[PDB]
């Protein structure tokens, strides 16, 4: 039968037989989505531009709003705020949450495909909440995803059970499970990074991207792809198969992208996908997070390809 | 004062003079857009996936644009990327305009949900002989009309006319077209290079080399960032409102470039130029390029005239 | 072949090779009836409720700017404000709009259907647009109509090649043709008036009523329909056939309905579509103004039944 | 604090310590009525019309669907089938769904409010599951309520713990909680029947209409409204208050409404806001219903307007 997000969260919980505060966050979360997603869409543009007579900014405010509001959380970490937000204690519940509420947005100005991209957490320790309980290795995510807003607008949740892909049908305003169980190829044709760094770049990623440029094999060339906005690089890689990489420009040291709320939700996608994603040096999900905005380096995507990054990354030690 | 799409056609025709065939045919035009543009946000999925108890999108957009123009009484010729021959307008429908377009342009990676698009140009009938697939083949420099629908992030209208290149963002909660950027203008220079990397095997050695120089620039500048999305609606667009440049250029593999002369390159070429960019094929512009099949492919350079300069020096380089 | 609302306009435009003015202005009116679609409906409710942490009026804003913004009108009569709006010189056009924005809305805390009702004419004199030019007889309009915003959104568009109905299909904001050139039943089966007026009403609106209720010619009796919101009772008068009345009543001695932006633009639609509308003493057309809130009665519809209202008021004289 | 109604029940069913599947059915009936919602408005109408070269079917379907799927049901009576839906062994819960799926779709070419009513028992036999569950009287209900497709969309749910009024927000398709523990008005000033059936009426019927509209003191009559779709005239009996009937008389001498799936989820919803709603015999929901289609009198609304009718009911029995 067809399956909603909702409903689909609600059976595998029964199933858990767990209290519902992760469904209650689901739901929230997913409520704080539809909500950006129209926004993301402009819709009511029109009465912005006089007809009767900020967007990152509203989209943190929608995810903080609707997640303090579901009685499902303590803290939150979010790309927009300096600090972590501790919930009142009224409102507390036993998870952590670290998002960014738009991803990319930056770049929204050319309409670039943007998303909000979360990890779940539960509280581990038993302190009174704190800054503290989002540093966590990714290893112990309960839950994990993204919002993409592209042509169409999909939510990708990643949990124990495997990777699920619901699509956002907008007339209705549900999110439909159209993919299911979800696995990434072994290999793919497609690397992405932002190649206008090529002059920082390690000889081990150096070497790579020459490889994929230039087989040693005379097998076909991998295809480039970069929209320059990780969630939709990402889904791409999901779905088709490839390689990403954020690697530290030598020049931006530990990374571009933050462990928390970008790193980690996609790498816990990744391998709940049967992906790989690494900092080159160790697994992106065993860093031990020091900083609530800490960035890493990240290579993602097909285990093969990955690998064969691995490799490479191995010989120039 | 706010102002639609319609409305912002309407007033230009008016001032014009014009019969209203333009304006018709433009009003068909953004209807099939905004038919596409919920097409494409997958409105209505939930029953392809069983709700209760066909056409691909690069067809539904086809048959969307071929209707609506059609039945515009506007035109006359239609030429399609889905479509090998020209579509001659039934006579009872037959109005002055050939409109040529991709309805659904970066299709084929339209599973990953990247951003798609729709492009058209649209030129006057130039003779009054019967309408036949000569009537396409004008150049780009003919071009009434030109522009595309990216449906991104938000869907937006771009259109190019003589008054200028005008951006409409469509409000899907009335479904118009707002005017939001007017009479949009190119920066000079750019900061960012778009094109496939993956094949630099195959590279023209001036096009590896004016690349190289983007990354390795002898100067002490700044490197250009990279962006490439693979859907040239997407990756023309922000060209448009970042500046840089785009490249899809000739080599041995291809020396006629990939993309297509009559609905890919010459309406983004004519964007381009009424934005103060410019669009080269390496050899020459892009709008004078005189066609002799519909489906003809061209190189396309485009972007901020400064990169687009420096890319003719390195281009003439190797002769 | 399909046909929208806009293009519609256009080719009949073209035909009628006038200047544009009137399609402009029926295009702009057509924009701000989706925006008042779009928030009777309740699009963003959500924000105001909280999620990130009145509807006549805006009705009226939404009709006010676009029509003043079209080029194409002068002055403009609404229910919501006590005198003719004067259009500012610079964007002055040679049409006068009367129009209900919200029609049936001190009810809309029911989820009632409502309506924006609206009818066009030339202005008068060459001197100043003054209030002035909104006083003429309904038959000098040159469009009428009303959209409702009932089940669905449905603009009724009159014009002297006759009346017109759209499907706005919220998928894609756009007014489908739907029914082209509408006639109204010669005869219909049901009747619709406050009969909570009962006590109030003249002999011949009591004569009338009680011979639908027990036939003369011991034929089925009509059914009784109310909403309560003119334009869902009138268009349902229009779709099914039989009468609408709003007659006189002691806190309504001339009627309540208004003359201007009410009773002609549905009076002009019913002509339009061979139905008929008259205030008991003449046709609602016919009646010349002299206040811009002026209120007539009105009883209108399927020829067959207004006939045999007037035999009545004609026998009580 | 902004709610929504898949976390209000949620919350509600977490504090009743609950399996989660009254939730989980709640939640998949929400989203048939949304894509109700969506079919009701028209979208995608333009492709009806060709631009590319039902509704109390697909309404049915719609909830039959979402139902089944729910795991939530075993037994299904839609006005739409004769016989019961016995919910096949692997999709089967605990609950029996009585709805209508498009009440007052007759009249639905007229554009006028349409809407969904649904009452929700638990099953009562260890038998396996048969029609026989489904014949419970109203008294029994767990839950009942209806979506009413008006102006907005709006979902009112009653249950033990009192009515709730929720709205559609079509931009994100959420239902938000706008009015809670709602009560109806003690008395009201609105009095709802077909009048052009006089001829037909119970004497009692025409006698407590007459002094509705003929009040023996000297007193303000009431007004009269009659959608003629049973959804839109009970929600505004319950936003405004008043009376609705839908009495016996010697032609039908049970009635038209249906038992089951209109008469007592109307009936729980105005008890439940301190409403009333009477045969004239005894409860709607004190019926023991002997036949899944069977018809009750239905007389309802504010307790002393009920009450004033009954007393002129006990003057003619
Ligand atoms: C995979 C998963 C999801 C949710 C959970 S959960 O939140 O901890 N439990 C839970 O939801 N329990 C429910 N009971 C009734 C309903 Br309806 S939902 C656990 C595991
Ligand atoms: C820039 C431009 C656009 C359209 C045209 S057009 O189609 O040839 N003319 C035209 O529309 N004239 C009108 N007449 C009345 C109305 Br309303 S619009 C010309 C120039
Ligand atoms: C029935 C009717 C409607 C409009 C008009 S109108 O406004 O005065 N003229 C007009 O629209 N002319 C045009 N022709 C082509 C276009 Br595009 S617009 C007249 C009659
Ligand atoms: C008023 C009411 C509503 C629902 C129910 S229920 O379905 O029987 N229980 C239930 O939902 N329990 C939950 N636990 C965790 C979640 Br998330 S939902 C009971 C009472």
Same mark, same amino acid.
């Given at each position: 039968?067809?399956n909603?997000?909702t ?88 998870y ?98 932002n ?10 990623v ?45 020049? %931006? ?16 996608v ?15 999900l ?19 390809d ?10 120039? %030690?």
């Open positions: 039968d067809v909603t997000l409903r689909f969260v609600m059976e595998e919980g029964r199933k858990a037989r767990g209290t519902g505060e992760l469904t209650q966050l689901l739901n929230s979360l997913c409520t704080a989505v539809k909500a950006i997603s129209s926004a993301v869409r402009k819709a009511g543009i029109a009465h912005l531009y006089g007809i009767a007579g900020k967007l990152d900014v509203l989209s943190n405010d929608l995810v903080m709003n609707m997640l303090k509001s579901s009685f499902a959380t303590c803290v939150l970490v979010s790309e927009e705020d300096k600090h972590a937000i501790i919930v009142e204690p009224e409102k507390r519940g036993k952590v949450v670290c998002f960014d509420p738009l991803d990319g947005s930056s770049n929204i100005d050319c309409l670039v495909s943007v998303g909000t991209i979360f990890g779940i957490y539960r509280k581990k320790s038993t302190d009174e909440p704190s800054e503290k309980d989002a540093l966590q290795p990714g290893r112990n995510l309960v839950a994990a995803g993204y919002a993409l807003y592209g042509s169409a607008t999909m939510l990708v949740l990643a949990m124990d059970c495997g990777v699920n892909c619901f699509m956002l049908d907008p007339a209705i305003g549900e999110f439909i499970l159209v993919d299911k169980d979800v696995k990434i190829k072994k290999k793919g044709k497609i690397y992405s990074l190649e206008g760094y090529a002059k920082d770049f390690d000889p081990a150096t070497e790579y991207i020459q490889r994929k440029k230039f087989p040693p094999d005379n097998s076909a060339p991998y295809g480039a792809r970069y929209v320059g906005s990780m969630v939709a690089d990402v889904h791409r890689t999901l779905v088709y198969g490839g390689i990403f990489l954020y690697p530290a420009n030598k020049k %931006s040291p530990n990374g571009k992208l933050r462990l928390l709320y970008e790193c980690n939700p996609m790498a816990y990744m391998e709940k996908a049967g992906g790989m994603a690494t900092t080159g040096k160790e697994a992106v065993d860093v031990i997070p020091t900083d609530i905005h800490q960035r890493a380096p990240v290579i993602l995507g097909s285990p093969d990955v690998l064969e990054f691995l490799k490479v990354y191995e010989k120039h %030690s």
